[PDB]
């Protein structure tokens, strides 16, 4: 089954969320944001010393 | 995506480590002899080359003229360009002559 | 494009045995018991249909790709160089900006 | 890793077409083919070897030979007795270790036939061929006279500098001859001077290796043992037809012959067409004889590309 | 002090040549201009629970390096205290243990230059109970059982000098081929020829023994000290001594050849 | 393989007669599919065959 | 047809060992397994006017290449016709020539397969007034003048089988030790031994005297092809010969030695 969910962007922040099912018991979700990694595209221009 | 353009993608040409999915499934043995029958979709290279369109070189405005070992263009003439020239003064002439 | 593998099967006479997984792109793996293994040289092994068998799969670029590669290019930041030549009394001058 | 191709054996295979029309084993057996190549030359991969000596034979190298396997066992013959045919006879362009490089007109499928004399054993597998050229004109065959472009070919020299094949030991083999049950209790028969192994699981998984000895073995039934003519000396190649061994651990490569390499090729240069007069246009005459691809484009902000395909 | 590698009893024969084949490719110097100065410790951990049973490498301690972590989760979780490279407690925590990470660990040391390399095998388990979460020593490995998500710590600790930091000058890998004379018990020899690390030869004795004493231009290079001896003399007669010293690895060894002059037969 | 005709010849060594007639031989198989050759792996249906 | 490169008489010692040096690093054969299919020209000016007085590329053709200009400016005004390396005309075109573009010229054609280069210096002026334009010829160069903006040609034409186009297949390069047998005359040997460029090498005679007849493994590769003959007897005497033939450079030479056996003295 499929679920949406909205987190903060944040480290060691469980969230815990619930999902809905006729007949079956509502299932725990823990979800966990363990780091960051904020990676860009760059090019090497020149050098200077 | 199976059936798609790169379907296959790799960081280099000859890079040891590869991702891909293209929706492989096994078939059980259905013969006398020792044989695995593979279903696959056919590869997506060679489906973006029979309709990848036309190409660029057909499609630039203003004729650019593109060359692929720097990716990018030339002779290509669209727009203005204000400029300044600086010119020695030993370059002009006195009117006296 | 790429190419299939189907490398030589793996069999079980007459007992069990267990799938595991492969680090290679886009690999498949599954058992099937009651196998019926035959071959040229007969029936591989013996058992009253006990054996069974598992097979796997995965892909690779082929040799031709060495030369057929087709790379995708993100861009940006488009940047143009001009040639100019200036004339002055009767002096030709050149320069790339 | 070396190049060396003595170290390995050819094996059998299981073509699905041969000379009945209907699947069987064979040692010509193909699974991989090639047509990249602009000129359109095609790589066919073949369980069995040639170009080189029969393997385990004192010299290695030999064009001429032909090296085969059947009734277990290998055996030279001659290569000049293999043909080629997808729509017609086909021209050989090399053969290297497993793989050959031919040139042949477009078809459906792709057959490999070997006579031995008084026998004849062919094998085919289906593949699209169809014939295609470079530029923007599909022509006939390359002309004398034209523009020349660059393009991609393999080369017809031994020599290759591209692709990697693996290559490792074989697994076991099985065989009926080995074993005789005209009487109820068990008999086996190894083929002499050859040690042999041989397994049955009647209460245990016993096992027994006679080396040219008949060792018989307590549980009856003759589907109740099997034998293998374990030699684990020649290499074999990872295909379907084939049995891993338990070690599944790789132990060489090798070269794939007549690798992709670019070079000039000719084109044609069509009639130039005529250029004619119209107000704030202009109406053109084209004229060919096959079919050609012409386009054009506004030279203002707007593309305005257009593209067609003219036959005549 | 050295220690003896082997002891030989050569039958030199008179006028013919004999050789010493005292090296080692371990011995080998680096030949760019840049020896290497750095080493490297890390872990790997082989858990069949994948099934990829596969190694992976939790992460790597470079000499005056930078800690590096492979992938992007074991940051937190894989603490490798940095001091602790000076100290060689080159031990591994685990914050949270999960089912899919009990496995084998592995911690491995790899050194360039010395040529010197080492691997110690552990293994950890997880349970649901804690009543059965007690290690154990099995002599060839040791096993970790601790409950899920428990922090765990895992031990790799070496105690050698070589691997703990000494930033002493590169002294030259001394190399010493002295023979005793002839009637002379061993220890008494007299320096033949010294090989410095930097490729510099000091001769000792006459030139044409010396020249005729053959030895690789290349052997301070390639390690190939063992010495060819050609038209053996009585003079050559006597024990031959091959003394290696690498202070910066800190190796010390020393081969021992009885050669004796034999008339030919 | 089909075509429009089908011709059969004799050699008598030296001298060679054939003789051929027309007809509409084209490629056909059984199932929701007409493919190119009868593969390794697939079901099993009836047809119908001339007996060698 | 092979042409004699020298004729040197070896007075070859019985018993001793006899060096016939028959080689050429010129002949080398590429070691990597993608051997050099491609070779290249280009024009280079070496004006004085400027300052810098350096050599400047203006262009260069690749075979089976595509035209690409060092500059943004030579484009339109260099014009090499890409039909002309079939030709092998290999010339240059200005189409507007100024007072700073006068100078020296040169036509270079490079080879790293055969390693083979030539090299071709021309001059160009430019005055303002077309009476003094006109060519001429020095026998080590030519010398053009032409008026300031005019079109000009410089020509580069070798007109060489090996420079213009042929996709022959790559024979191996021959190579042949053929001793005359004794008392024979010249051109009448029976090949000791034959050399591939492929590496291998067919053995003719005796073993054992092809095993004395020691050549350096890798001949083939380094070209190194130079017969030493070893335990001289007296049926090695005769004139031998080294041919050696590359079809695909179209090179052919062959070295005559007169070996005649001499006892010692
Ligand atoms: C042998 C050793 O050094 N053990 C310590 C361990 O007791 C401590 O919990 C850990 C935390 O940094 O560091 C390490
Ligand atoms: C079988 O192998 C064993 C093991 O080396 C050997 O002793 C025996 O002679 C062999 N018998 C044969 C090859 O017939």
């Known amino acids: ?49 | 995506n199976p059936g798609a353009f790169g379907d296959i993608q790799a960081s280099s040409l000859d890079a040891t480590d590869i991702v891909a999915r293209t929706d492989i499934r096994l078939l059980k043995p259905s013969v006398k002899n020792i044989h695995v029958p593979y279903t696959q979709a056919v590869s997506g290279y060679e489906m973006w080359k029979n309709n990848s369109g036309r190409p660029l070189q057909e499609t630039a405005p203003f004729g650019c003229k593109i060359e692929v070992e720097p990716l990018r263009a030339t002779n290509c003439a669209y727009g203005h360009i204000p400029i300044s020239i600086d010119i020695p003064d030993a370059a002009f002439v006195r009117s006296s002559e | 494009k790429f190419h299939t593998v189907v490398p030589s099967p793996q069999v079980k006479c007459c007992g069990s045995l267990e799938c595991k997984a492969s680090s290679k792109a886009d690999y498949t793996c599954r058992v099937f018991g009651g196998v019926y293994p035959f071959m040229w040289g007969g029936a591989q092994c013996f058992c009253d249909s006990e054996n069974t068998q598992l097979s796997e799969a995965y892909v690779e670029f082929a040799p031709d790709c060495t030369i057929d590669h087709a790379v995708a290019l993100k861009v940006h930041t488009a940047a143009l160089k001009v040639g100019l030549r200036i004339v002055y009394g009767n002096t030709t001058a050149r320069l790339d900006t | 890793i070396t190049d060396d191709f003595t170290l390995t054996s050819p094996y059998l295979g299981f073509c699905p077409y041969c000379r009945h029309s209907a699947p069987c084993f064979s040692p010509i057996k193909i699974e991989n083919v090639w047509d990249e190549s602009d000129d359109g030359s095609i790589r066919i991969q073949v369980s069995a070897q040639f170009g080189y000596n029969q393997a385990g034979t004192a010299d290695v190298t030999k064009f001429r030979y032909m090296s085969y396997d059947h009734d277990h066992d290998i055996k030279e013959d001659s290569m000049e007795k293999l043909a080629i045919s997808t729509s017609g006879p086909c021209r050989r362009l090399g053969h290297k270790g497993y793989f050959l490089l031919a040139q042949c007109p477009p078809g459906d499928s792709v057959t490999v036939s070997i006579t031995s004399g008084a026998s004849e054993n062919s094998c085919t597998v289906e593949k699209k061929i169809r014939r295609k050229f470079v530029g923007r004109e599909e022509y006939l065959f390359p002309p004398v006279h034209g523009k020349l472009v660059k393009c991609h070919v393999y080369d017809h020299l031994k020599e290759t500098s591209a692709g990697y094949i693996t290559m490792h030991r074989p697994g076991p083999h099985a065989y009926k001859s080995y074993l005789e049950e005209a009487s109820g209790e068990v008999y086996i028969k190894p083929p002499s001077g050859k040690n042999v192994t041989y397994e049955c699981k009647c209460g245990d998984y016993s096992t027994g290796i006679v080396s040219t000895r008949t060792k018989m073995n307590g549980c009856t039934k003759a589907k109740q043992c099997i034998a293998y003519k374990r030699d684990q000396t020649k290499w074999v190649f990872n295909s379907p037809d084939l049995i891993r061994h338990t070690d599944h651990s790789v132990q060489g490569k090798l070269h794939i012959p007549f690798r992709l390499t670019p070079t000039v090729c000719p084109v044609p240069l069509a009639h130039t067409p005529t250029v004619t007069k119209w107000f704030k246009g202009i109406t053109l005459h084209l004229t060919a004889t096959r079919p050609t691809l012409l386009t054009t484009r506004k030279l203002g902000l707007r593309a305005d590309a257009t593209a067609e395909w003219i036959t005549g | 002090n050295s220690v003896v590698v082997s002891v030989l009893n050569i039958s030199a024969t008179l006028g013919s040549q004999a050789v010493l084949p005292c090296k080692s490719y371990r011995m080998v110097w680096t030949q760019d201009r840049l020896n290497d100065r750095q080493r490297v410790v890390h872990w790997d951990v082989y858990s069949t629970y994948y099934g990829d049973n596969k190694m992976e490498r939790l992460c790597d301690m470079y000499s005056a390096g930078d800690q590096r972590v492979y992938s992007s989760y074991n940051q937190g979780r894989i603490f490798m205290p940095q001091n602790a490279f000076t100290d060689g407690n080159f031990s591994l925590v685990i914050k949270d243990v999960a089912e899919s990470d009990g496995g084998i660990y592995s911690c491995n040391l790899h050194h360039h230059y010395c040529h010197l390399y080492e691997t110690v095998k552990i293994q950890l388990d997880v349970t649901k109970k804690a009543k059965a979460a007690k290690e154990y020593w099995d002599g060839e490995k040791a096993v970790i059982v601790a409950l899920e998500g428990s922090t765990v710590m895992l031990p790799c600790v070496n105690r050698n000098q070589i691997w703990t930091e000494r930033h002493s000058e590169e002294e030259q890998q001394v190399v010493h081929w002295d023979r005793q004379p002839p009637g002379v018990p061993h220890d008494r020899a007299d320096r033949l020829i010294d090989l410095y690390a930097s490729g510099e030869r000091r001769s000792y004795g006459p030139l044409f023994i010396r020249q005729k004493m053959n030895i690789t231009d290349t052997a301070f290079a390639l390690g190939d000290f063992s010495l060819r001896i050609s038209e053996l003399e009585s003079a050559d007669e006597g024990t031959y001594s091959c003394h290696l010293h690498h202070h910066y690895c800190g190796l010390h060894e020393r081969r021992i050849y009885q050669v004796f002059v034999t008339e030919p037969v």
């Not at chain 1, 469980?14 to 960051?36: C, D, M, Q, W």
């Open chain 1, 1 to 49: 089954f499929e679920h949406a969910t909205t987190v903060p962007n944040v480290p060691g922040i469980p969230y815990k969320a619930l999902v809905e099912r006729a007949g079956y018991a509502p299932l725990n979700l823990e979800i966990t944001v363990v780091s960051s990694e904020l990676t860009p595209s760059t090019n090497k221009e020149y050098v200077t010393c």
